[PDB]
Write a protein that binds this ligand. Sequence first.
Ligand SMILES: O=C(O)CCC(=O)OC[C@@H](NC(=O)C(Cl)Cl)[C@H](O)c1ccc([N+](=O)[O-])cc1
Ligand SMILES: O=C(O)CCC(=O)OC[C@@H](NC(=O)C(Cl)Cl)[C@H](O)c1ccc([N+](=O)[O-])cc1
Ligand SMILES: O=C(O)CCC(=O)OC[C@@H](NC(=O)C(Cl)Cl)[C@H](O)c1ccc([N+](=O)[O-])cc1
Lengths: 139, 139, 139
Amino acid sequence: GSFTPSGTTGTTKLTVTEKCQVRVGDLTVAKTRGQLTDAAPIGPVTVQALGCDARQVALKADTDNFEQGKFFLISDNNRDKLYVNIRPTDNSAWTTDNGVFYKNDVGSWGGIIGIYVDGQQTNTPPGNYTLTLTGGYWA
Amino acid sequence: GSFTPSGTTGTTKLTVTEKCQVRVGDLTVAKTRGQLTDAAPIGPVTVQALGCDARQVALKADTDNFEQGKFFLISDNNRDKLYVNIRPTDNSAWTTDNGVFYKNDVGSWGGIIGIYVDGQQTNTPPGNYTLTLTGGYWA
Amino acid sequence: GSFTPSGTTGTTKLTVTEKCQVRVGDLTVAKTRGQLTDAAPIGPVTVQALGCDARQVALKADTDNFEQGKFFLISDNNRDKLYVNIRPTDNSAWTTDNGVFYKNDVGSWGGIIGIYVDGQQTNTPPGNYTLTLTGGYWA
Ligand SMILES: O=C(O)CCC(=O)OC[C@@H](NC(=O)C(Cl)Cl)[C@H](O)c1ccc([N+](=O)[O-])cc1
Ligand SMILES: O=C(O)CCC(=O)OC[C@@H](NC(=O)C(Cl)Cl)[C@H](O)c1ccc([N+](=O)[O-])cc1
Ligand SMILES: O=C(O)CCC(=O)OC[C@@H](NC(=O)C(Cl)Cl)[C@H](O)c1ccc([N+](=O)[O-])cc1
């Protein structure tokens, strides 16, 4: 049961605002707190594995993005959490183990991992939220 | 008289150089210190508000970018200032209040905010300068 | 013998992985440690000088990227080095002096600087490696 970092990093960012929302500069992913309903999509994460025919593809969340079997985006100040579910768009089987989301079967998997709001969190404080996922393999 | 953060962040960057200027890597906004003449344009900042029919759109500068009713880009080391004026390209009326630039009338305004050199500053030390503006609303 | 910073910054990034490599998110430059063979190209660095007819174009590496006449990409944690050679793709003559790579002749040079693995380093620890180069001039 261990993760070996071996791959690149994907960063999922979301800015939460109030109903009166002021977008400054280039387009980024932003939602009102009212839009943070259960199962609301936050964004996709592409995964492309190579040379993993005999290993289980895995993604490890940054330390600040997990606790107690749960994943969450975290505010810039490290204070506020936005709980999420992480799920492949296909029908593949994965397991969660202490910040690690790994594939049940070996193979050089390619696919999309979706990040979804876990439980309505319409009271989330406005701010910039991040989830960082690093590629590697589990055993 | 208070700002509520509610929106995204726009970052205005400028690299100041000497006459002999060496651009490394991708194109970025760069000027010689000799080009930092009064009213010289540094760049535009897009603003798009939504759901603000009953609020005054506002932009708040990072703490390190204002003092004494004045705005400035700040060097990477926090030491050197480049004083600027912030002005909408249209004929709309705005007010400055302690790092906050807010619109006089309520409404979901969309427009361009220009950043301009305030007073000739042709002796500015070469370096990378930044101005950070966060969207929200004032009352 | 001194460098005057005057220009922009180019950042060369490389993620080193094991054979089982998991790419997460957008495409970035990544190699297996087995690919870090001698003279292996890491990437190009564009250089465009202006107003340097009477100066020697120069690039200075960040402090953490050089020591003892040698250049290296450095890991995120500052611990691990990946030694490189820096060489213009054309036939121009340059000199290295304590973290500074400068052109022997004056002139507003434009060209490509290649970054290459210096000596096989197939045991490099997986991680994210960076080399930062700032433009300016030498005398
Ligand atoms: O994406 C966001 O920024 C917010 C969520 C969204 O787009 O709503 C719905 C959306 N789904 C997702 O973002 C899920 Cl989280 Cl993967 C959409 O159906 C979609 C986008 C991208 C891809 N893809 O690249 O394969 C598949 C499906
Ligand atoms: O922009 C820079 O990088 C330097 C300033 C400049 O472009 O000089 C002149 C320029 N103006 C500005 O940058 C002002 Cl600061 Cl908005 C130009 O007229 C312009 C650019 C973009 C837009 N727009 O997007 O609507 C309107 C006008
Ligand atoms: O580049 C990488 O990401 C890895 C190295 C590579 O591309 O292998 C080979 C490659 N060379 C380089 O990257 C050297 Cl380090 Cl400049 C290629 O021949 C090339 C790329 C770009 C340019 N250019 O912009 O002028 C010239 C030549």
